[model samples]
Target chain A: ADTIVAVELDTYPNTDIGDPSYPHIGIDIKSVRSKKTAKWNMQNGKVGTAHIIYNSVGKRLSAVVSYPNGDSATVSYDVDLDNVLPEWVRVGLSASTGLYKETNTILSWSFTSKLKSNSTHETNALHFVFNQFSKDQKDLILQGDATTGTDGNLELTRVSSNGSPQGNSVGRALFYAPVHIWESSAVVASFDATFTFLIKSSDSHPADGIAFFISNIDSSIPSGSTGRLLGLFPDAN
Target chain B: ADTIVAVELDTYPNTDIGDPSYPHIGIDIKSVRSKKTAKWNMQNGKVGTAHIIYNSVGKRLSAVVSYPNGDSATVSYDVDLDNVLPEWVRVGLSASTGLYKETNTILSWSFTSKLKSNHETNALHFVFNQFSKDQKDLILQGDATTGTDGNLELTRVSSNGSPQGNSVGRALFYAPVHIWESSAVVASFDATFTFLIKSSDSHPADGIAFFISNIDSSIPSGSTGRLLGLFPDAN
Candidate 1:
């Protein structure tokens, strides 16, 4: 099990390893002995936004955490990814309370990548990448009652279509233009599509679920299809 | 083994299973009875491309193949994925010569998805996060491109007294910047950036990078013209 290269927003101070004498931030590499530290007294019951960056060329991981009070800090660390970490890896957020009673929660997160395939297995296999959808929703096609410009930037085709198309009704949102799977015989063409969606409910028993699709660019809508089929199929049968 | 739902591009005609007369494309669900077909000519030694899509809502699997000469066809079929296959499944492209002499070569391919997680294992165990800034926390060696208006560009793009060529600049945040400890780090990380690239029509050649380097950084001499200012002159 490997440790990590991270910018740590430490909450408490201890003497065992170099936690400093006050609340602070740190650039940690594979150990609790944070190599770099900066002072920041984290405010209780307040939210902050943190922007982090990792540059592959130099294996540099940096963080810039900012608060509404105009307080911010930057820290960084360099790790040998080629030698220290495998090429294909999983990423997530984590927190630990060291001898102190604390609560840590993640509000939301978005991720994107431009990593070229480096593994033999991945290079030879067909792969589908997942990227967080664009909040701007540019060029997105709205069928039925789908709309944008709200939380999550999508209205799910019927979140409130006059709130009358009601629960038994259906709608669809599609990409405005056809993504070219084959532009021509001259240059090889490929396609990559990724998006994120969250279905919110007003009651304990959510009305229905959602489905993703890829169909003819000019496919027509199926009327009277709703509820269980998600307007995808006429019926579950 | 879970069966597959696919769009088939066939080059031959056979009867037992209702195979059409010409080179054709079919929407198949687990078997060769190809529920859907489109007529296509199997040209001897020319290349073509196909666009295939599967819609979960309509249970529709569609295909549109276009040749360089404006020849194209569309075909689709509805299949019960929930009734025929598992939620988490494997996908790929398959082709068989079937006694016909041919060469199938995939020059390049790409895919994207929004499918929820499946029964898979994760590799990187996220360990930590947070940092604070100090006044002397960062060092600006030369004129490190310091523009931060939603997006970042390293070189100066000012039209006023700004001939930003043949120069070396740098900016660094002071930190450990190195892994001094030891751990078998199987790290998996993802970072996405949307950026713009532009330059003078007359002097349009340079590069930039977001990178991490060790503390022992040295400035290279001037009269340089490449590598996004990441290297010294080739003297």
Candidate 2:
């Protein structure tokens, strides 16, 4: 009912091969028996490991990409993998970067059916953690005054402080994945999530504030949005 | 074949349900048709989101429970769900906590069958990161003088530095998940793991080491266990 996809990219120490068609290095979890695919982009010359562990019973998938440069991303997919079969699995490079690329490199990939059970449902009613997420796992989309990027192992909140001592400078980044935590019609059950974040301002008296919010709309930033609302709610609406 | 589980705990501000048997909040993935049941424990008189995602193809499952108090845990499951029918799925709360429960809160829960693809295999060489993992995801077993703990965001690791500069105290934790890098059934793979440690001991002879070794067993204590088979004769 589930599939586990993993990829280890060993890239050559060379710069861009000048071919956009070739992804330089990539990993694909394809089912030869059933046509199902999940793809993630990897840097051309960067070395790292990408893992996606899927749980059929829970109907959720967790994807993690880690780099030696202290950069990593963890993103989860809440989609259906009903038609995907494990036996007909493929794990390898599906494309190249350049036509005349000369390279002798090692590609390590593996796909196996591994299952895990959760036992922490009883005691701690809540469980979750958050920190800097890698690019692939950067579900939050930047909008308005907000700019987001990875700082080594940290997800940079705001590159520059935008608010005045008494005024407001707002930036908003919404998660791309509409976090559907619980559902009745489908087999969605209970959830406990943890969020860990750090906020700093070069400004002595930072006026406006940052927030972690869940809204109905993805791109809900209102026009001229800033300050008190944290670029979340509009001034009029 | 896939299913999902989620929970929205609309707990009362008041504590104590007067009944321990009834969990104030909880979620379970039970198959009425196949008689297969998997459940997670939850607290009473609390409000939060409890999410559990399952993938049948790999026979694995991952669960997350998040709250506003900076508490979160990500747990996974590896089991065979061959008998559970995906089409014949049913999702709902199976129990109750108390009779005088509060108003019905709008619990935002959803389910869908989604497929994804990954494409980063060739030029990326190797990618990895270190962060706080749940106790279940710790993978490594602590032994000798090694000590490790999670402080919400980062996993603190410390080796042996508790001696009087004359004695030796060794601490170690082995990852249960044997990392396989290349084509090998055993632990054989090329990897670039990073270790960032801090030492502020006044002892001029402060000593510690970070190691990666393959062993057939885990032990509680001993000089041989301390060396990780590097000195087989030390046993």
Candidate 3:
């Protein structure tokens, strides 16, 4: 048996007082493995005007993909492995939707566990990752939106009747549409503008787009060629 | 073919648009092992007034013994083995010249690595882990040269007396010391404290000492025995 004492008294008490020696401390974090199941459902959406789509494989997971305003969807997976998080790690997010776009998609997740400090066993941990794509369906009116001063103008340099169609793969397509709004007071302000763009695509078959808020470039936003632009992206056939 | 363009932009010009489809920022970091020699050293008494006779064990390692400040000459080890610390390590320190019983002797090693982040492959990675032990010495005079309060207090704890008397093997062991202190005076904190204590039949036999301190648990500060009073809390 050993007598272990640790306290900061005002000073060394009734002992010989030759500075005491040999102190110690330590911690041990071990690894345990267990399996868990996950599930997902769409929180909300607008069908064709603004639709949401998702899919998963294997013991895979998936979540809801929604519109301009930030929204969330739950996705679950069976985690058969447990790793001690020595440090922080961010959940990975990329897209694989019908139209892979760079629309701002916010994310979050939570997990459950039942283990004590002195307990030696595995506990459940949760994780989430996102993959969404983009598409450009047309009522097609360009530069019809209100001017956002120097920052929001979508100055269409040219327009053609037959613009290339959206691509086959989700991420291989682009989404370009326009809206109309009233003009601001300043004569310097252009009422024709499309300020926010959520250009998204997957690591696979990427079809990039330019969501313009201004009229110029370092100033050209070239649309990809289908077989080529009415000035939109993915210059498709 | 997808054109992979790697270009550095002049500055961040924020419009209503944010770069999403294509990330504009990226970075990379990595860890790899290479060749080189690792090292360990100490300024001896600079670790502080703890007691345990110290003995150097070549270029690889050293050992020590710290006592119960009065009853025993406890033990510790200072080892500089290989580039990285050994998974399993054992060290010990003994008294010399004879059991003088005063002026406790000390042994400790503060480890240091030869390698820094940008160094060549052959340079050792930088690190410093100290192993130490103190022997319990007798205090002849509280206010004299060897006293705890006064530097000149006369101390009778020595390597020659206790640890040597207890079989030297009794002083051998390893432990993780939980050392702590407070600058604001009220800061409370905790971790863990552990160590292995052993002794030869000629020494005080098999025993152990647990400790806590404002000083680092790995280093020596010459506190001995009930000075080692922060131990035996295994309940």
Error of 2 at A45 (Å): 26
Residues B69-158 of candidate 1 have per-residue lDDT tens digits of 556555755553445654333233332222222332222223322221211212311111111222254354554433433212233445
Best by DockQ: 2
Q: Candidate 1 at residue A39, lDDT?
A: 74
Task: Put down candidate 1 lDDT per residue, A1-237, tens digits, no spaces.
Answer: 232434455555654446677656565554445667777646554454444444333344445444545565555555533444333332322332222322232233333333322211121112332232344656555555444534444444443423222355455555554432221221112122222333333333333333233344454345444443334433222
Give the range of the ten consecutive residues with the poorest summed lDDT in model 2 chain A: A95-104
Specify the poorest-scoring 10-residue window by lDDT in model 1 chain A: A116-125
Can you rank all candidates by DockQ, best first? Answer: 2, 1, 3
DockQ of each: 0.02, 0.05, 0.01
CA lDDT of A51 in candidate 1?
44
lDDT of 3 by residue, A1-237 (tens): 111110010011111221122110101111000011112111222110111111100111111222233332221222111222211122111111123212222121111111111111111222211121212213212222111122221212211123221332111111121111111111110011111123222333222222112111121223231111112222221
Q: Can you tell me the CAPRI class of model 1? A: incorrect
Off by over 4 Å in 2: A1-237, B1-46, B73-75, B80-82, B88-95, B98-104, B115-235
Docking class of 3: incorrect
Winner of 1 and 2 under TM-score: 1
